[PDB]
Write an enzyme that holds these catalytic residues in place. Structure first.
Site, PDB file in Angstrom:
ATOM      1  N   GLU A   1      17.974  51.274   6.750  1.00 25.83           N
ATOM      2  CA  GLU A   1      18.483  50.735   8.050  1.00 25.83           C
ATOM      3  C   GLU A   1      19.996  50.971   8.086  1.00 25.83           C
ATOM      4  OE1 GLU A   1      17.458  46.443   9.271  1.00 25.83           O
ATOM      5  OE2 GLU A   1      19.631  46.577   9.562  1.00 25.83           O
TER       6      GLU A   1
ATOM      7  N   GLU B   1      16.869  42.616   3.465  1.00 25.74           N
ATOM      8  CA  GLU B   1      18.154  42.005   3.036  1.00 25.74           C
ATOM      9  C   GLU B   1      17.847  40.677   2.346  1.00 25.74           C
ATOM     10  OE1 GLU B   1      21.176  42.527   6.054  1.00 25.74           O
ATOM     11  OE2 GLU B   1      20.541  44.568   6.418  1.00 25.74           O
TER      12      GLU B   1
HETATM   13  C1  QG2 Z   1      27.163  40.022   7.710  1.00 23.81           C
HETATM   14  C2  QG2 Z   1      26.516  41.374   7.763  1.00 23.81           C
HETATM   15  C3  QG2 Z   1      27.165  42.493   7.231  1.00 23.81           C
HETATM   16  C4  QG2 Z   1      26.582  43.780   7.274  1.00 23.81           C
HETATM   17  O1  QG2 Z   1      27.173  44.808   6.803  1.00 23.81           O
HETATM   18  O2  QG2 Z   1      25.336  43.960   7.855  1.00 23.81           O
HETATM   19  C5  QG2 Z   1      24.626  42.910   8.404  1.00 23.81           C
HETATM   20  C6  QG2 Z   1      23.402  43.138   8.995  1.00 23.81           C
HETATM   21  C7  QG2 Z   1      22.682  42.058   9.543  1.00 23.81           C
HETATM   22  O3  QG2 Z   1      21.456  42.263  10.087  1.00 23.81           O
HETATM   23  C8  QG2 Z   1      20.771  43.525   9.959  1.00 23.81           C
HETATM   24  O4  QG2 Z   1      21.478  44.498  10.771  1.00 23.81           O
HETATM   25  C9  QG2 Z   1      21.274  44.465  12.200  1.00 23.81           C
HETATM   26  C10 QG2 Z   1      22.541  44.124  12.923  1.00 23.81           C
HETATM   27  O5  QG2 Z   1      23.237  43.155  12.500  1.00 23.81           O
HETATM   28  O6  QG2 Z   1      22.793  44.840  13.938  1.00 23.81           O
HETATM   29  C11 QG2 Z   1      20.136  43.512  12.644  1.00 23.81           C
HETATM   30  O7  QG2 Z   1      19.839  43.773  14.028  1.00 23.81           O
HETATM   31  C12 QG2 Z   1      19.160  42.787  14.822  1.00 23.81           C
HETATM   32  O8  QG2 Z   1      19.573  41.438  14.615  1.00 23.81           O
HETATM   33  C13 QG2 Z   1      20.920  41.167  14.948  1.00 23.81           C
HETATM   34  C14 QG2 Z   1      21.153  39.720  14.598  1.00 23.81           C
HETATM   35  O9  QG2 Z   1      21.614  39.602  13.251  1.00 23.81           O
HETATM   36  S1  QG2 Z   1      21.190  38.395  12.392  1.00 23.81           S
HETATM   37  O10 QG2 Z   1      22.276  37.627  11.785  1.00 23.81           O
HETATM   38  O11 QG2 Z   1      20.488  37.468  13.288  1.00 23.81           O
HETATM   39  O12 QG2 Z   1      20.357  38.858  11.262  1.00 23.81           O
HETATM   40  C15 QG2 Z   1      21.191  41.463  16.410  1.00 23.81           C
HETATM   41  O13 QG2 Z   1      22.579  41.259  16.737  1.00 23.81           O
HETATM   42  C16 QG2 Z   1      20.812  42.895  16.690  1.00 23.81           C
HETATM   43  O14 QG2 Z   1      20.957  43.131  18.065  1.00 23.81           O
HETATM   44  C17 QG2 Z   1      19.374  43.162  16.279  1.00 23.81           C
HETATM   45  N1  QG2 Z   1      19.043  44.603  16.439  1.00 23.81           N
HETATM   46  S2  QG2 Z   1      18.317  45.014  17.841  1.00 23.81           S
HETATM   47  O15 QG2 Z   1      17.858  46.424  17.881  1.00 23.81           O
HETATM   48  O16 QG2 Z   1      17.137  44.110  17.951  1.00 23.81           O
HETATM   49  O17 QG2 Z   1      19.301  44.841  18.912  1.00 23.81           O
HETATM   50  C18 QG2 Z   1      18.947  43.808  11.745  1.00 23.81           C
HETATM   51  O18 QG2 Z   1      17.731  43.233  12.240  1.00 23.81           O
HETATM   52  C19 QG2 Z   1      19.287  43.345  10.316  1.00 23.81           C
HETATM   53  O19 QG2 Z   1      18.476  44.039   9.346  1.00 23.81           O
HETATM   54  C20 QG2 Z   1      23.184  40.755   9.524  1.00 23.81           C
HETATM   55  C21 QG2 Z   1      24.424  40.507   8.929  1.00 23.81           C
HETATM   56  C22 QG2 Z   1      25.167  41.544   8.369  1.00 23.81           C
END
Ligand code: QG2
Ligand code: NAG
Lengths: 74, 383
Positions: B185, B67
């Protein structure tokens, strides 16, 4: 009424998906867990993963661009 | 908020062994926020890790960044698609130099179109398009924080995915026509999934519909966030127990072939139908057999009549329904009224079909999904 007729297209493949069409991710976040080694060691989890073969396992996520390889680290 | 973090040779070997011993093909994302002064990519760390894996005999494909659209939000750095294009050429050179020169490269793992990602991806594909074996993008339907039960059952939510995909194919066709398009993803809801939703039978409408539509619209590979982890969208819980989407993902692999066909309802929002050639690896099923799968989001049972000349064929039902008392919010599922559990830590259950009276209509209860194998279909396309 609740009876629905289906139409099928069966003349030719419209697309070919990979045999690995349904693949899976491990988030990069998980390489920052103390229990990481324990978790991927699970032979139960490996039973579950093998049932999905063939598939890609993508290691990535937000932390992809906040992980630095240490060949000196344990 | 997000800080740099080191990882050992043991981390890599753990991860490689898990994939190798599970029969899965590891794809590894490299840190694309390591920048030279001129804001170009620094490859030395990545160079250390290529060297290690090559020394160890590790068959691994590669990505660079996740991203990049929001590197400005995530790390106060803007990287344009052209530069990220150049950065991918730099890395592709190193893989050609390295001992696994045939190593595959996937990118740029941009978010879906609604996150203002089109320019970045088009600039990226104009510049770096030539070295990547597939285009990777990400899709989530909802915010985990605000996602409701009704959102998970809403055909208008499922349908926004169709436009996401049309928009991605528009950028790609204008830059690298015939380049493979991968969901790199994807899940129900970002921020780690919708609590008590992303880990239930209810998550299966979004997972099975995404699979049907991805296959129908020319996506070649769909990568489910996540097999295992903290997020509620995990296929396997923290106690290594399979959730309803695991059993759905397994039954899909058993029955659905690589050859995508098409089905439609003569009436087309709450009854979602998908048709492929049957996976003939099932000794039960032979070339020419069809795998239909159907989602019913109506609140009543529906009776699907097969079209001529398939009205009188023998049909195997694989109907998935929650194990109560939590209904669509259940973390347990029955195949044809039999609860799906691991027989033990070594052993998956059989997935028993339910053969239907030949010439009977296909029963699909309210808020359910089912596979139907049409035996002796004898579709030449399915050869
Ligand atoms: C704003 C927004 C819109 C959208 O459509 O997709 C998104 C995906 C995003 O991020 C993406 O989608 C996932 C999501 O978030 O679920 C993230 O998941 C990890 O990171 C998240 C934190 O997000 S972050 O802001 O710190 O990056 C955690 O909540 C989540 O548990 C963890 N997966 S886990 O298996 O380890 O539990 C991914 O790493 C990332 O590529 C971030 C923002 C968006
Ligand atoms: C289904 O939904 C409608 C909403 O218009 C409702 O009024 C109807 O009684 C419902 N039927 C069943 C069987 O729950």
């Amino acid at each position: 009424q609740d009876v629905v007729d289906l139409d099928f297209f069966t003349q030719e493949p419209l697309h070919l998906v990979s045999p690995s069409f349904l693949s899976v991710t491990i988030d990069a976040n998980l390489a920052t867990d103390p229990r990481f080694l324990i978790l991927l060691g699970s032979p139960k989890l490996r039973t579950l993963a093998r049932g999905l073969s063939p598939a890609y396992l993508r290691f990535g996520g937000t932390k992809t661009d906040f992980l630095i390889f240490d060949p000196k680290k344990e | 908020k997000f800080k740099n973090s080191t990882y050992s040779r043991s981390s890599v070997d753990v991860l490689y062994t898990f994939a190798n011993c599970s029969g899965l093909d590891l794809i590894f994302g490299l840190n694309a926020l390591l920048r030279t002064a001129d804001l170009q990519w620094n490859s030395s760390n990545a160079q250390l890790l290529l060297d290690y894996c090559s020394s160890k005999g590790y068959n691994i494909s590669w990505e660079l960044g996740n991203e990049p659209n929001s590197f400005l939000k995530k790390a106060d750095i803007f990287i344009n698609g052209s530069q990220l294009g150049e950065d991918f050429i730099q890395l592709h050179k190193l893989l050609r130099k390295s001992t696994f020169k045939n190593a595959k490269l996937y990118g740029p793992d941009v978010g879906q179109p609604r996150r203002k990602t089109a320019k970045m991806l088009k600039s990226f594909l104009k510049a770096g398009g030539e070295v990547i074996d597939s285009v990777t993008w990400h899709h989530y339907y909802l915010n985990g924080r605000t996602a409701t039960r009704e959102d998970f059952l809403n055909p208008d939510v499922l349908d926004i995915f169709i436009s996401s995909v049309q928009k991605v194919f528009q950028v790609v066709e204008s830059t690298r026509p015939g380049k493979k398009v991968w969901l790199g993803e994807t899940s129900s809801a970002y921020g780690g999934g919708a609590p008590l939703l992303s880990d239930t039978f209810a998550a299966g409408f979004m997972w099975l519909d995404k699979l049907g539509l991805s296959a129908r619209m020319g996506i070649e590979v769909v990568m489910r966030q996540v097999f295992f982890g903290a997020g509620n969208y995990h296929l396997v819980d923290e106690n290594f127990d399979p959730l309803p989407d695991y059993w759905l993902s397994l039954l899909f692999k058993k029955l659905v072939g690589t050859k995508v066909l098409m089905a439609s309802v003569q009436g087309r929002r709450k009854l979602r139908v998908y048709l492929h050639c049957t996976n003939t690896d099932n000794p039960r099923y032979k070339e020419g057999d069809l795998t239909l799968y159907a989602i019913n989001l109506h609140n009543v049972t529906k009776y699907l009549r097969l079209p001529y000349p398939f009205s009188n064929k023998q049909v195997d039902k694989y109907l998935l329904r929650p194990l109560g008392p939590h209904g669509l919010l259940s973390k347990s599922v029955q195949l044809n009224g039999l609860t799906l559990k691991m027989v033990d830590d070594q052993t998956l259950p059989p997935l028993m079909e339910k053969p239907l009276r030949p010439g009977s209509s296909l029963g699909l209860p309210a808020f359910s999904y089912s596979f139907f194998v049409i035996r002796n279909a004898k579709v030449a396309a399915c050869i």
